[PDB]
Design a protein around this ligand. Sequence first.
Ligand SMILES: O=S1(=O)CC[C@@]2(CCCN(c3ncnc4[nH]ccc34)C2)C1
Length: 167
Amino acid sequence: VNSFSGYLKLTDNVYIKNADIVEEAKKVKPTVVVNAANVYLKHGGGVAGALNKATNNAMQVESDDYIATNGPLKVGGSCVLSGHNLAKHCLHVVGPNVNKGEDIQLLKSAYENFNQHEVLLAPLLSAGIFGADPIHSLRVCVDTVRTNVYLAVFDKNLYDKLVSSFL
Ligand SMILES: O=S1(=O)CC[C@@]2(CCCN(c3ncnc4[nH]ccc34)C2)C1
């Protein structure tokens, strides 16, 4: 038994809720929150900018030190850093950027990072809101992640669409 509340069950191990991941993190304080990162750990908008803002920029300060030491992540890769005031740990995961021409198959590699953690609070990666992109993003999550993942979907029309379309 864990502390996540109000989630719909998609499969044995995947749960979903129309929620803002930042509000979910503050309320639950999970062991792992996933950030939808870029390779530079530049947290400007979306999940990353909102998580970072909620840490009062401490996530960005830690991230810049990480990059200065280690260089950029790989697309499809990840690193574990502090969760600051939001979680014990933040797993920064880089999904492919299709508007950069980055291979859509890297999305499966990105989700494979989740399997190194028993339970995670996470957003959809390389999904966005419009088109078939988000549907297929959740399809890859379900078919790749084997650990217990609690998905917070910010857009309610998208949440409703995902639940109603999920096979
Ligand atoms: O939900 S979406 O339509 C699926 C793709 C999307 C892109 C923007 C950032 N998103 C978030 N997801 C969950 N919590 C969030 N808090 C702040 C942003 C955010 C994910 C929106």
